[PDB]
Design a binder for this molecule. Sequence first.
Ligand code: ATP
Ligand code: ATP
Ligand code: MG
Ligand code: MG
Length: 1217
Amino acid sequence: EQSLPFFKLFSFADKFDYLLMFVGSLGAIVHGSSMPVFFLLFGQMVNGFGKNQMDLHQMVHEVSRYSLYFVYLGLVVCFSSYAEIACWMYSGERQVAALRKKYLEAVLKQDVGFFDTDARTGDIVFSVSTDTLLVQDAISEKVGNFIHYLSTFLAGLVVGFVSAWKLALLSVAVIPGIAFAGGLYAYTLTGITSKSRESYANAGVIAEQAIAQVRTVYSYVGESKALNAYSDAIQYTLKLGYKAGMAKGLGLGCTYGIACMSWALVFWYAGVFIRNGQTDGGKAFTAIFSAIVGGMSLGQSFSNLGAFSKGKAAGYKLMEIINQRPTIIQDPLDGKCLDQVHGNIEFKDVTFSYPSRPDVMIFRNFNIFFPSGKTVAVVGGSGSGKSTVVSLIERFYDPNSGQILLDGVEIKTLQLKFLREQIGLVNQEPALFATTILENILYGKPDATMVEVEAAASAANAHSFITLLPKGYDTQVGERGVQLSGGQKQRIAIARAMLKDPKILLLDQATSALDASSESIVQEALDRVMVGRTTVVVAHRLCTIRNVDSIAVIQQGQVVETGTHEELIAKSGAYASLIRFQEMVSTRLSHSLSTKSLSLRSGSLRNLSYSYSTGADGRIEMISNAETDRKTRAPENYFYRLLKLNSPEWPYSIMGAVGSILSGFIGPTFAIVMSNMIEVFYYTDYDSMERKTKEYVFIYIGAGLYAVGAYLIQHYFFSIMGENLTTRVRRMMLSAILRNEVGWFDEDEHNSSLIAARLATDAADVKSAIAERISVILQNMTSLLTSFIVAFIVEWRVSLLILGTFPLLVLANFAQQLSLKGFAGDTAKAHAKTSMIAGEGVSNIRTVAAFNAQSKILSLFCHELRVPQKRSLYRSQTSGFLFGLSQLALYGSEALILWYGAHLVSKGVSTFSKVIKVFVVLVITANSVAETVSLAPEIIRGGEAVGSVFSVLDRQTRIDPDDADADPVETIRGDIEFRHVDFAYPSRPDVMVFRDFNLRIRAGHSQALVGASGSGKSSVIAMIERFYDPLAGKVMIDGKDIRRLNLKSLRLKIGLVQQEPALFAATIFDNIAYGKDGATESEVIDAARAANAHGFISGLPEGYKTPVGERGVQLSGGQKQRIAIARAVLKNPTVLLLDQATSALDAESECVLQEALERLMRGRTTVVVAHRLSTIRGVDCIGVIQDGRIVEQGSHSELVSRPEGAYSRLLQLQTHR
Ligand SMILES: Nc1ncnc2c1ncn2[C@@H]1O[C@H](COP(=O)(O)OP(=O)(O)OP(=O)(O)O)[C@@H](O)[C@H]1O
Ligand SMILES: Nc1ncnc2c1ncn2[C@@H]1O[C@H](COP(=O)(O)OP(=O)(O)OP(=O)(O)O)[C@@H](O)[C@H]1O
Ligand SMILES: [Mg+2]
Ligand SMILES: [Mg+2]
């Protein structure tokens, strides 16, 4: 959408922020112009240390002077890298933490009708969680990196064009020659990676179907050919992944092969310009290296323009609510204030519709009257808009035509602090703000005294239940410290709505907890608060309204009938149908936020996003998404187990380890040939310098072709090894998911959107954990090792001093690589406790706006943004000082080497080019050792969260489909028998749907398990085949227990017909031959014409070939049912299972079932459940299930012969349509 400029993000800056962005913008320019000044001091040293080869007294006075200028260069990098980190991290905190205080003043003052849960308070909650962390990413510390490397470019050219300006043009013209082939590489690597993501989605839905339809893959045993259709469509991503390793070996060989053919260009013309008497060996070392590392420092300034475009998109969404004008506002002077109220509410000619869609008309000419000191009741039987009345006295909306008089005074002339001070609200599942249970009661009144809080808790049946809690009125209700965790809460709103002492009380449908004798406790507590108050009762069910003096009824836009409950039961006017209807009878925001966090979590950093959940019933819980540190949960032997799985490719690891050592010979050979030409440039024999610099250019060219052939071996191999592992792992993951029990799939984090991406993202990052972390170890440890053997043959007295310094030269190059990604780690973890206070002052704003609790959600937020500011003051002063102090041991220790080397030459021990060769080789080596120790924790710290997918391999199923020590099944005649069995669901173990259940189904009979409004009726077929095991008891089948048999050899002769039949994405020739392996045309045509649909199946364009499940032709609910019966007649089972429930007919003119329900049962033992009391006249036997028991058994001549029982009550519901 629209976007702000890059400025106006700095509009929350006070006068102390214009001082930290000025001291912190001299620290970014002085630290920038220090690497092109290091090349000016190290260049002028070599002129003093190497022109004086004949006078060893002029040497020592000109190396002792320039090695004092490195200690002076250290103190200017120490005190100016301190000033760009300690001043841009703390000034980027104080600006975003005053954006949070004005965005929350803005989102507490908009109208309450703005938040109607229609993905509106799932965007406000997301904009306070993540859009505020994108402004802080953009303006804090990636602005210091923008000024640092831009001024390294501008200072790298001025040092370059002053020393030697001809060599500063040959070294800049080379830079397009390197960035072209280093940028054309990155184009042709995304062109393979994007085709890999495209060629995977053919196999991305075959894994997806077998998880979301797992009950059908088990009943028809085809869990061994959901692998063979998944092991074929991965073989086109393996082969396309072989040529994304060759396009990297040719992309790094031909990028290191042009740079090596460009040091042969700049060091040949330097050898011509010295012989002409124009330069020397220190003005040319300066000019070449200052213009190369200066021009390369524009790839790091422009790397920050990606975060600068996220911080302008996110920052506009926040800045369009901060200055948004609401409608229903407070006027402190243009608003009256009455006294001695009485509570006479009257809607005089009010019409109103919700502003989400003005098409409907809820309140067409609405007219009521609420007396003083009395009780009323507003009741309906459908969506009549009776909860809208209590959502309109609060002024959450406006009546767009009409007026509302309070004691004859219009409420639009009263401000919104006198109206809401006299009205108290109680609503559904009341707001429990995550504080103690003294602070929640003190929202109705802030502080009067202590004894009134106990007095309000006394007359609510609330005093005893907070004294059987071993803490003194101080209990965490948000987190489960001490659990008042009953479904019957104490409705502590009633404790709030008594301490406030309102004159008008707006109750609501407060029977929403499956009411019983437990919920009758607060029923009389409501009868002890509705005294002397003009209260209303919005009643959902009429069973609790039966003692109310006056009741009004609305049906369509207006009131219909009023009066007491004697003429209400009389005359049958629009109330007798409602009492007939009484006889015949959040966790969603977390799914909205995580899918909004989906497709925005592969590009965004893991320390900048969240992951959402439900938590307890106190708040929405936010995990900082850098939980990989606190998890630390992989097996201790995970690195050997991923090598045992990756062994058949042992030739493709030996032939890549003689390609990773040969790449470690290119680095330490560049630093020998380049440090042999510093020596040669100080010759005075201008013909023996020409013929010895032709032989140092030919090495640069000949080893610029060695680099092409030694990165093609390292990266074509180790990609054959690493793409036969992510193919082998994904097959071992799907073959282990489709072996677990059914109840494992029923949980909330095992749905088919977080479990089919673990095979797509968490299974393809095992390549960069055991193949791309060996290639950069064999390479970097044969470069460290070949440069401590050469450098102890040349000279061992200087290189033993560098060996004692070497922990300090690798610690300074380790801090220079953490600074490319910033020193303000995991910034989403400190801003998690502060965000949940805004994350529940928005989703509970219907109770925040009531009680006038708006100035307390803001003072629990300004008083609690002080914790991440003292965490970001101590972290910026420390990390900014330890960075600059470790840059002082990098320049103050290269001045100890070059001084001790100059002392050996003047005593006649060493020579020139024995100190420079030892210096250049052992310093460039130190820049590679601090890359190996940067990936050193992740090898120990369990890989990471994506390399920790062993929980699908190392997991023990409860129901094992295949056993060797199990009896094989040859014939089941059908002997279904249930012994004393009770059962519950593992997803919710409190409900006890079965209680000593018993059946006995003889062979050659049927069964007609009755509806009974869902008394556990579609759970008997879920134990005939083991979708769930019982808690206690035995399931008897063929005179044997069911937990003794080969499960795969039992499910191929028990075939069900699903509740809502689903079809795979294929033709109607596989979906009618998935129930029998090997049938082609012989019994397939006959399997059509048994539940026939033959004109439906011959009337079709390509014969029996059309996609019907996904991305194909659409069928109806009556025709999909016809296909699933064709499976069950092709398979020809012995035990048949049917399942129909909860209005699943979905088609008038019922003929899709009447043909199949009588032909199919002629030789089988069938079990039939149907929710309607029609077409269920199975004349063998019929039983009734109630609360986990059978109550009556016998055919349909001993079932209606009893006068009532329980069956004839259901016979009354036949005429109740
Ligand atoms: N944000 C909204 N947009 C459109 N329609 C709404 C919105 N909120 C509520 N409604 C409608 O208002 C009606 C309110 O019905 P009613 O007053 O009888 O309350 P209820 O359905 O008994 O109880 P509850 O309000 O708890 O569902 C609903 O049928 C619903 O369709
Ligand atoms: N996997 C499950 N998860 C949660 N609750 C279940 C599960 N299976 C059964 N139940 C509970 O047990 C009862 C099952 O009754 P049954 O499924 O036989 O018919 P039904 O519930 O009327 O049909 P439907 O399940 O299609 O609504 C339901 O009320 C449900 O609350
Ligand atoms: Mg509703
Ligand atoms: Mg159900």
